[PDB]
Design an enzyme around this catalytic site. Sequence first.
Site, mmCIF file in Angstrom:
data_model
loop_
_atom_site.group_PDB
_atom_site.id
_atom_site.type_symbol
_atom_site.label_atom_id
_atom_site.label_comp_id
_atom_site.label_asym_id
_atom_site.label_seq_id
_atom_site.Cartn_x
_atom_site.Cartn_y
_atom_site.Cartn_z
ATOM 1 N N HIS A 176 0.855 -1.186 0.000
ATOM 2 C CA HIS A 176 0.000 0.000 0.000
ATOM 3 C C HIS A 176 0.890 1.235 0.000
ATOM 4 O O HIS A 176 1.392 1.657 1.044
ATOM 5 C CB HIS A 176 -0.932 -0.014 1.207
ATOM 6 N N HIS A 179 -2.738 6.957 -1.328
ATOM 7 C CA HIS A 179 -3.717 7.604 -0.452
ATOM 8 C C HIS A 179 -3.065 8.393 0.681
ATOM 9 O O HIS A 179 -3.657 8.565 1.749
ATOM 10 C CB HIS A 179 -4.707 6.580 0.111
ATOM 11 N N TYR A 181 -0.448 7.861 2.724
ATOM 12 C CA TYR A 181 0.036 7.195 3.921
ATOM 13 C C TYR A 181 1.568 7.156 3.889
ATOM 14 O O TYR A 181 2.198 7.895 3.125
ATOM 15 C CB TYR A 181 -0.632 5.820 4.032
HETATM 16 N N1 TXP Z 1 -6.858 2.741 3.956
HETATM 17 C C1 TXP Z 1 -7.180 3.569 2.805
HETATM 18 O O1 TXP Z 1 -6.323 3.807 1.952
HETATM 19 C C2 TXP Z 1 -8.614 4.129 2.646
HETATM 20 C C3 TXP Z 1 -9.067 4.757 3.825
HETATM 21 C C4 TXP Z 1 -9.911 6.064 3.593
HETATM 22 C C5 TXP Z 1 -10.667 6.164 2.326
HETATM 23 N N2 TXP Z 1 -9.874 5.599 1.035
HETATM 24 C C6 TXP Z 1 -9.766 6.626 -0.004
HETATM 25 O O2 TXP Z 1 -9.622 7.823 0.514
HETATM 26 C C7 TXP Z 1 -10.380 8.882 -0.524
HETATM 27 C C8 TXP Z 1 -11.317 9.726 0.202
HETATM 28 O O3 TXP Z 1 -12.635 9.341 -0.085
HETATM 29 P P1 TXP Z 1 -13.867 9.930 0.886
HETATM 30 O O4 TXP Z 1 -15.023 10.442 0.009
HETATM 31 O O5 TXP Z 1 -14.363 8.809 1.792
HETATM 32 O O6 TXP Z 1 -13.257 11.218 1.832
HETATM 33 P P2 TXP Z 1 -13.972 11.739 3.293
HETATM 34 O O7 TXP Z 1 -13.879 13.242 3.378
HETATM 35 O O8 TXP Z 1 -13.246 11.121 4.455
HETATM 36 O O9 TXP Z 1 -15.585 11.263 3.321
HETATM 37 C C9 TXP Z 1 -16.286 11.308 4.550
HETATM 38 C C10 TXP Z 1 -17.348 12.351 4.490
HETATM 39 O O10 TXP Z 1 -17.230 13.167 5.508
HETATM 40 C C11 TXP Z 1 -17.618 14.524 4.937
HETATM 41 N N3 TXP Z 1 -17.161 15.507 5.649
HETATM 42 C C12 TXP Z 1 -17.858 16.429 6.306
HETATM 43 N N4 TXP Z 1 -16.986 17.237 6.898
HETATM 44 C C13 TXP Z 1 -15.759 16.812 6.608
HETATM 45 C C14 TXP Z 1 -14.499 17.301 6.976
HETATM 46 N N5 TXP Z 1 -14.212 18.478 7.825
HETATM 47 N N6 TXP Z 1 -13.392 16.690 6.550
HETATM 48 C C15 TXP Z 1 -13.489 15.585 5.754
HETATM 49 N N7 TXP Z 1 -14.715 15.108 5.398
HETATM 50 C C16 TXP Z 1 -15.859 15.730 5.827
HETATM 51 C C17 TXP Z 1 -17.031 14.461 3.451
HETATM 52 O O11 TXP Z 1 -17.735 15.398 2.515
HETATM 53 P P3 TXP Z 1 -16.821 16.095 1.317
HETATM 54 O O12 TXP Z 1 -16.906 15.252 0.052
HETATM 55 O O13 TXP Z 1 -15.405 16.169 1.762
HETATM 56 O O14 TXP Z 1 -17.336 17.501 1.031
HETATM 57 C C18 TXP Z 1 -17.193 13.262 3.098
HETATM 58 O O15 TXP Z 1 -18.424 13.140 2.283
HETATM 59 C C19 TXP Z 1 -11.013 8.152 -1.450
HETATM 60 O O16 TXP Z 1 -10.245 8.140 -2.681
HETATM 61 C C20 TXP Z 1 -11.100 6.715 -0.856
HETATM 62 O O17 TXP Z 1 -11.122 5.819 -1.817
HETATM 63 C C21 TXP Z 1 -8.643 5.151 1.305
HETATM 64 C C1 FMN Z 2 -14.572 2.426 2.874
HETATM 65 C C2 FMN Z 2 -13.340 2.375 2.019
HETATM 66 C C3 FMN Z 2 -12.185 1.771 2.499
HETATM 67 C C4 FMN Z 2 -11.044 1.723 1.707
HETATM 68 N N1 FMN Z 2 -9.900 1.127 2.193
HETATM 69 C C5 FMN Z 2 -8.763 1.058 1.419
HETATM 70 C C6 FMN Z 2 -7.611 0.450 1.910
HETATM 71 O O1 FMN Z 2 -7.598 -0.043 3.037
HETATM 72 N N2 FMN Z 2 -6.478 0.401 1.128
HETATM 73 C C7 FMN Z 2 -6.489 0.954 -0.137
HETATM 74 O O2 FMN Z 2 -5.478 0.908 -0.836
HETATM 75 N N3 FMN Z 2 -7.630 1.557 -0.624
HETATM 76 C C8 FMN Z 2 -8.768 1.617 0.151
HETATM 77 N N4 FMN Z 2 -9.907 2.222 -0.344
HETATM 78 C C9 FMN Z 2 -9.889 2.803 -1.729
HETATM 79 C C10 FMN Z 2 -10.383 1.720 -2.689
HETATM 80 O O3 FMN Z 2 -9.611 0.551 -2.531
HETATM 81 C C11 FMN Z 2 -10.334 2.142 -4.154
HETATM 82 O O4 FMN Z 2 -9.080 2.704 -4.471
HETATM 83 C C12 FMN Z 2 -11.435 3.135 -4.491
HETATM 84 O O5 FMN Z 2 -12.483 3.043 -3.550
HETATM 85 C C13 FMN Z 2 -11.966 2.806 -5.876
HETATM 86 O O6 FMN Z 2 -13.174 3.489 -6.082
HETATM 87 P P1 FMN Z 2 -14.488 2.648 -6.458
HETATM 88 O O7 FMN Z 2 -15.269 2.419 -5.186
HETATM 89 O O8 FMN Z 2 -15.311 3.437 -7.449
HETATM 90 O O9 FMN Z 2 -14.095 1.316 -7.048
HETATM 91 C C14 FMN Z 2 -11.051 2.277 0.432
HETATM 92 C C15 FMN Z 2 -12.210 2.884 -0.046
HETATM 93 C C16 FMN Z 2 -13.352 2.931 0.745
HETATM 94 C C17 FMN Z 2 -14.600 3.584 0.226
#
Ligand code: TXP
Ligand code: FMN
Length: 360
Positions: A176, A179, A181
Site C-alpha cells: 500500500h 492515499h 500514507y
Molecule cells: N486505507 C485507505 O487507503 C482508505 C481509507 C480512507 C478512504 N480511502 C480513499 O480515501 C479517498 C477519500 O474518499 P472519501 O469520500 O471517503 O473522503 P472523506 O472526506 O473522508 O468522506 C467522509 C465524508 O465526511 C464529509 N465531511 C464532512 N466534513 C468533513 C471534513 N471536515 N473533513 C473531511 N470530510 C468531511 C465528506 O464530505 P466532502 O466530500 O469532503 O465535502 C465526506 O463526504 C477516497 O479516494 C477513498 O477511496 C482510502
Molecule cells: C470504505 C473504504 C475503504 C477503503 N480502504 C482502502 C484500503 O484499506 N487500502 C487501499 O489501498 N484503498 C482503500 N480504499 C480505496 C479503494 O480501494 C479504491 O481505491 C477506491 O475506492 C476505488 O473506487 P471505487 O469504489 O469506485 O471502485 C477504500 C475505499 C473505501 C470507500
Amino acid sequence: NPLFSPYKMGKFNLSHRVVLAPMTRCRALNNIPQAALGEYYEQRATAGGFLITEGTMISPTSAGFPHVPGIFTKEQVREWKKIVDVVHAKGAVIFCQLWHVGRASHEVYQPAGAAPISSTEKPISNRWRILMPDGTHGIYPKPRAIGTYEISQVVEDYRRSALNAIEAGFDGIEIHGAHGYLIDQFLKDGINDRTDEYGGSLANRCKFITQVVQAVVSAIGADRVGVRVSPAIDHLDAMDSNPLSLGLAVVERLNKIQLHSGSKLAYLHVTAEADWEARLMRTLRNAYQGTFICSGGYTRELGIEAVAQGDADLVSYGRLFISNPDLVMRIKLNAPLNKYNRKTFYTQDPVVGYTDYPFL
Ligand SMILES: NC(=O)[C@H]1C=CCN([C@@H]2O[C@H](COP(=O)(O)OP(=O)(O)OC[C@H]3O[C@@H](n4cnc5c(N)ncnc54)[C@H](OP(=O)(O)O)[C@@H]3O)[C@@H](O)[C@H]2O)C1
Ligand SMILES: Cc1cc2nc3c(=O)[nH]c(=O)nc-3n(C[C@H](O)[C@H](O)[C@H](O)COP(=O)(O)O)c2cc1C
C-alpha cells in the site's frame, strides 16, 4: 465480455478480471481478524477470482483506523489462516495489503500515546480529520520524522509481515503506497521536505518504496508482490507538483527491480479520482512492464471498455463490491446493483452493513 476472458497473473491463472479492491472496514476487533472477515471475503470470492484484503498493520505503530487487521503477531497469523482457507475453498486468489499509515494516525492508535512516524514533522492540515474509536473525529498530531536507521527498521517490518502473510496462506501481498500514507509521505514532494538521501530529487523520494518492494521481493518472490500507488490523489495533503513525472519515476524503479531479480512483479495497481490528452492511468500502464490493475470509479461499462481498449489487464472495484457480494456475477449478467451505505463503512458490527447486503 472481455472482463471474463482468463488472465495469467504470475503463477495464478485467473478466470476473470474483476478484482476486489482493498477496503478498510474496521471489523477486525482489537486488530485480530475475526470470523466475520472470513464470512465477508467468502461472500465475494469466486472460482478463479482475485481478492485484495483491507489494509493490514505491519507493526504496532502502523495503524490509523480503529480495529484494522494486523499480520505482525502470531495470533493474527493463526486467525488469518482460517480466513484464507475459507477463501481458497472457493477457488479464489487473495492478497494481503500491507498498510502503514505514517502521519495519518492519532495518539489513541499509537502505543503509549506516542506520536506517529513519518518522513516529515509537518502534520496533516486541519482541513482533514481522523476517525476516532468512538465514532467522532479528531486532530492529526505532529508526526516524528524518522532517521535512516528507523527507515530500515520499517522496511524490515514490511519484510516480516510479508513472510507472515505467506505463513498464513496468502497467495501474495500488495504494498500500500497510495492515499497519502507512510510510503506516499516519502513520494509526494508536498510532504517530503527531507534534506537527506530520502528527500529532494525523484530518485531520493522513490528510495523508500524501492527498498520496501525490494525487501518483500527478496523474501517471498516478485510474482507474489503487488504495488499500489496514487500519484494524482491529494488525499490527506498528498500533493505532488508533477504527479505524472512521479508516477513514471516509480514505474521506472519497478521495471528495474524486475530486471535485477529476473522475475516480474504480480501487478502494478494504480487508483485515481473516481470523478474521471491521455489519462495518467494509461501513461503509467504503457510504461510498466507487466500486469496493470486500474482502479477508481469504474463501472460495468467502463471496466469492459478498459480491458477491450488495452488500458488494463485487471479492474478492481471498491464501493460497489461492498454492497454487491456477487458483484462478479452481476457484471456478467448485467444485473442491477445494490446501493452502498457509507454510514456503515467503518462501523464494528460483524453483520450490519458488512455481510447483510443481499445476493442476487
Ligand atoms: N486505507 C485507505 O487507503 C482508505 C481509507 C480512507 C478512504 N480511502 C480513499 O480515501 C479517498 C477519500 O474518499 P472519501 O469520500 O471517503 O473522503 P472523506 O472526506 O473522508 O468522506 C467522509 C465524508 O465526511 C464529509 N465531511 C464532512 N466534513 C468533513 C471534513 N471536515 N473533513 C473531511 N470530510 C468531511 C465528506 O464530505 P466532502 O466530500 O469532503 O465535502 C465526506 O463526504 C477516497 O479516494 C477513498 O477511496 C482510502
Ligand atoms: C470504505 C473504504 C475503504 C477503503 N480502504 C482502502 C484500503 O484499506 N487500502 C487501499 O489501498 N484503498 C482503500 N480504499 C480505496 C479503494 O480501494 C479504491 O481505491 C477506491 O475506492 C476505488 O473506487 P471505487 O469504489 O469506485 O471502485 C477504500 C475505499 C473505501 C470507500
